[PDB]
Amino acid sequence: ESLTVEGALEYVELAPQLNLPQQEEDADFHTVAGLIMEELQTIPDVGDFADFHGWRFEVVEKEGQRIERVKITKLP
Structure with missing residues (x-):
């Protein structure tokens, strides 16, 4: 999976x-x-x-109640 981070990246x-x-x-x-x-x-x-400062952050996987993976894309 293309451009994704863990929820708990700082x-x-x-x-x-x-x-x-x-x-x-x-x-x-x-x-x-x-x-x-x-x-x-x-x-x-x-x-x-x-959406935040020109980027989109999307929760793709929840593990339980934790946001496990998020997908970063670019806004218009």
Whole structure:
């Protein structure tokens, strides 16, 4: 599977690689999965997604209640 990360990748680890923008100190999430929950404000099902700074984050696999895998694509 093409362009996917684990839910629990750290923003701090992903972002410098996608040039995502730096976060502030009052950080609301630390992980890809956390990013998704933050934007949605709810428990994402499979195939829920969040758009953020020009990218889309889509939950492809849930293991239980954990977001296991997310698929990163590009927005318009």
